[model samples]
Target: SYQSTIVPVELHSFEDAQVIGGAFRDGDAVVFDMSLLSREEARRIVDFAAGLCFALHGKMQKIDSVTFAVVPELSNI
Candidate 1:
């Protein structure tokens, strides 16, 4: 299940590819393809996946949170 959730990181490219890609390799990364998911769908997916891990180990933890920030247009800036 974790593997399925993680595979897309390697297969996709984004403006912040370096930072996002590194997160996956380092093991604290959770990347969601916003183009492929609605906000609600993304939330449910993360919650269910994280819950699966917590259920096995019996500890409460948050897997990740979605952050939407404004990135300036380079030429305009």
Candidate 2:
């Protein structure tokens, strides 16, 4: 059985240039600069974020979108 906790977790900003490419912002929805992570890292981070969402709000909210900024040195391919 799973129990729900109502205590709200303060959402804090996380910035890691090596992992998330400079600074990233999120609110009701979590956004990540995909170019900052490899596919595996992205998946792991997203999963971690989901756990955080559930812990904070008792549910994993749907993700709106994952966008990438255009950088000459960064490639999505």
Can you give the lDDT of residue 49 in candidate 1? 41
lDDT of 2 by residue, 1-77 (tens): 22122212222233232232212212223234544456665565556555454544423333333442211111224
Q: Give Cα distance to truth, residue 69, candidate 1, Å.
A: 21
lDDT of 1 at 50: 49
**TM-score of candidate 2 versus the correct structure, residues matched by position:** 0.38
Highest TM-score among the candidates is held by which one?
A: 2
Model 1, 3-39: lDDT tens per residue? 2233333212233344433443343324444445556
Clashes of 2: 0
Q: State TM-scores per candidate.
A: 0.32, 0.38
Question: Which runs of model 1 end up more than 4 angstroms from their true locations?
Answer: 1-34, 58-77
Question: What lDDT score goes with residue 29 in model 2?
Answer: 32
